[PDB]
Amino acid sequence: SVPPPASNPPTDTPPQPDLAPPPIDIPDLPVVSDEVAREEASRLAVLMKHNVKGFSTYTPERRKAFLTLAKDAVTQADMPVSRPQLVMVVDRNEKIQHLDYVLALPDAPWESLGGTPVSTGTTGRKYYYITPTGVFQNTADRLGYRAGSRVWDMGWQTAMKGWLPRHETGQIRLEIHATDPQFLEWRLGHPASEGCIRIPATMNKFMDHYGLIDALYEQAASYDPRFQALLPKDRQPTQIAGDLVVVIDSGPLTEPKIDPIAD
Ligand SMILES: [Cl-]
Ligand code: NA
Description:
The protein is an alpha+beta fold. The protein is built from 5 helices and 10 strands, in the order ααβββββββββαααβ. Helix content is 22%, strand content 21%. A hairpin with a 7-residue loop joins strand 7 (150-161) and strand 8. Sodium ion binds at residues 92, 120-121, 130-131, 191, 254.
């Protein structure tokens, strides 16, 4: 069977004239040397190994695929890498279904930290979408919410309907969700979502506490009480925090498949 769909409510940040800060009041994102960045990435990698269920470093061939396709995608999206920063790379291929944290460096080869199984969107089921490839940024344009378990809201995105071989797109609210009583952790590693990205509950808490993709969220929390209120009070944000979630597809690109029971 396929688990029921997650709820993916939009969380666009309302405009507030009273919170508009001058440039000096918005802190700059931390910039560390490549030497410091690599040491911090190694520390975080060891912590994830011992605190996130299902964590793995990958084989050399798999690491190369994560690193090459993620760099390819960021380059094609013309998104700049001007400081050492983490990137969450998700391989939606039906045969992989894993994420890899990568350290992007502006003037040196990127480095792989490791990651966990995930579940992205499945084919063959009406109203379930294939998770789209591309570069998705976690910005202060959205708040996300807490289920509490953190939910990251990546905005409306064009996605391919998973049940129509003719290739027909629609709009999904792309979000990152932990596992829960209706989407159990043993589902991870095979496609089973309606289009969202499911991650282990412990990976969700780790990302929340260390702020791995929350660089722009933390920046906004400096002056905006709505972002401050959603972030954990006991967090310990890493200086190499990033903001990009990059969905790749390494094998033959996912093709939709008919749902034999759809009318
Ligand atoms: Cl389940
Ligand atoms: Na998918």
